[PDB]
């Protein structure tokens with residue numbers, strides 16, 4: 001035995017500047033709770049996402065997203081670790097001035113291997129990969145029935161204060177049922193992180209470098225895919241209290257170049273707390 005728990009909350013913001021589809025930005029509140037006992041770990045989350053008009057005081061089309069995940073660690077050694085996560089979410093949508101739409105419920109099932117393997121005293125290879133099935137209101141939801149996503153690479157530890165991580169990242173959305181159509185996309189990036197450790201402070205500068213990316217949200221009128229270049233930099237800061245409440249702040253800017261398109265400017269901001277017990 002022994003049980004250990006974490007509870008926490010996050011508020012985050014995502015916003016393409018201009019009063020576009022995300023009006024004044026996407027605001028996203030969430031709470032989560034998790035519980036671990038040796039090889040088992042179980043996690044609950046609730047989270048909402050939708051655009052906001054702050055002066056009008058209004059939400060646009062938004063969803064909430066309750067979630068359950070259980071993870072089993074098959075093996076954990078300094079030399080090797082392999083674990084597997086099952087999960088499930090419901091995305092409950094509430095439409096606002098979308099003609100012929102009110103409500104929808106779409107589920108998402110995921111299986112995800114995860115691994116860590118020691119290369120030398122200082123260098124490790126780690127990653128996970130997830131496979132997702134979306135299930136119910138796909139035509140009104142406009143999601144694609146299937147997607148894969150992975151982040152995998154190398155981590156070098158220089159000392160107790162500095163480490164570096166480079167990852168390859170991929171996200172692909174695609175439909176295995178050819179009667180669809182909706183929301184296919186593909187993103188590939190390299191992400192690099194430079195975590196820095198001093199006492200109770202973690203500050204980590206990071207960046208994502210675009211490799212290749214396309215979307216086709218307008219497929220019904222324009223069936224060819226739109227290409228993009230995105231590059232992001234950000235900074236994460238956290239502080240441990242040491243008891244074990246901890247808090248964190250994060251900010252990132254992203255340049256969004258389109259092939260057809262004037263470019264966009266995107267900001268992400270977030271704060272969170274949690275408490276381990």
Ligand SMILES: CCCCCCCCCCCC[N+](C)(C)[O-]
Pocket residue numbers: 003004005277
């Ligand atoms: C569905 C909720 C499950 C109840 C979880 C609450 C248990 C709190 C116990 C705190 C004890 C701290 N402990 C055992 C980790 O040392």
Ligand SMILES: CCCCCCCCCCCC[N+](C)(C)[O-]
Pocket residue numbers: 007008009031245273274275
């Ligand atoms: C209002 C929803 C937020 C609830 C999520 C929990 C936030 C962190 C909990 C605060 C720490 C608890 N405490 C006093 C034992 O440290």
Ligand SMILES: CCCCCCCCCCCC[N+](C)(C)[O-]
Pocket residue numbers: none
């Ligand atoms: C540093 C503590 C920050 C606390 C921020 C306040 C949390 C928001 C409370 C949610 C309730 C919103 N409301 C009024 C619609 O019910």
Ligand SMILES: CCCCCCCCCCCC[N+](C)(C)[O-]
Pocket residue numbers: 013015024025026267269
């Ligand atoms: C102490 C933390 C407070 C700093 C808050 C920084 C504000 C970021 C503004 C992002 C703009 C998007 N917004 C708010 C209009 O949705």
Ligand SMILES: CCCCCCCCCCCC[N+](C)(C)[O-]
Pocket residue numbers: 009010011029030031046047048271272273
């Ligand atoms: C300081 C950490 C985060 C503060 C704000 C956290 C808001 C969490 C609220 C839980 C989300 C559920 N709900 C109903 C608001 O969507």
Ligand SMILES: CCCCCCCCCCCC[N+](C)(C)[O-]
Pocket residue numbers: 031032033044045046
């Ligand atoms: C993280 C475990 C689940 C706790 C969240 C409560 C279930 C969803 C109910 C909707 C309102 C969420 N709430 C109370 C935080 O605002």
Ligand SMILES: CCCCCCCCCCCC[N+](C)(C)[O-]
Pocket residue numbers: 007033044
């Ligand atoms: C000592 C209690 C600490 C509070 C956190 C543990 C409860 C989280 C799990 C309850 C799930 C929330 N619910 C009931 C709305 O589904």
Ligand SMILES: CCCCCCCCCCCC[N+](C)(C)[O-]
Pocket residue numbers: 003035042044
């Ligand atoms: C659905 C969320 C899963 C969390 C449930 C795990 C709670 C187990 C509580 C047993 C704790 C017994 N104790 C205090 C002696 O450790």
Ligand SMILES: CCCCCCCCCCCC[N+](C)(C)[O-]
Pocket residue numbers: 037040042070086
């Ligand atoms: C989906 C696979 C079935 C597993 C469902 C999740 C339940 C986890 C069991 C927790 C076991 C913890 N323990 C040994 C203290 O009982």
Ligand SMILES: CCCCCCCCCCCC[N+](C)(C)[O-]
Pocket residue numbers: 044045046064066067092
């Ligand atoms: C994971 C927590 C257990 C299930 C909580 C049920 C909340 C799911 C969302 C339904 C909408 C909630 N509501 C009416 C406050 O918006």
Ligand SMILES: CCCCCCCCCCCC[N+](C)(C)[O-]
Pocket residue numbers: 066067068090092105
């Ligand atoms: C049994 C615990 C599982 C927690 C996560 C499951 C949330 C499902 C709630 C969705 C309810 C939507 N509904 C039925 C109102 O349309």
Ligand SMILES: CCCCCCCCCCCC[N+](C)(C)[O-]
Pocket residue numbers: 070071072084085086
């Ligand atoms: C998707 C969540 C992971 C569920 C994995 C199922 C648990 C397998 C545990 C079997 C342990 C067998 N063993 C090693 C004791 O012989």
Ligand SMILES: CCCCCCCCCCCC[N+](C)(C)[O-]
Pocket residue numbers: 086087088109110111131132133146176
């Ligand atoms: C909670 C465990 C459930 C795991 C389900 C994982 C689904 C991965 C999606 C790809 C499957 C596509 N499909 C339906 C044609 O087979």
Ligand SMILES: CCCCCCCCCCCC[N+](C)(C)[O-]
Pocket residue numbers: 086109
């Ligand atoms: C390797 C562990 C995988 C977990 C087994 C998959 C069971 C869940 C299958 C998803 C659909 C479940 N259903 C039809 C009852 O809703």
Ligand SMILES: CCCCCCCCCCCC[N+](C)(C)[O-]
Pocket residue numbers: 068069070086087088107
């Ligand atoms: C890894 C945990 C497995 C999640 C258990 C499933 C909970 C809710 C299932 C609701 C089924 C939804 N629907 C429409 C397919 O019936």
Ligand SMILES: CCCCCCCCCCCC[N+](C)(C)[O-]
Pocket residue numbers: 041071083085112114128130
């Ligand atoms: C799995 C997709 C979510 C990305 C963040 C997860 C970090 C790597 C996976 C760790 C496995 C989960 N667990 C319980 C060991 O923390």
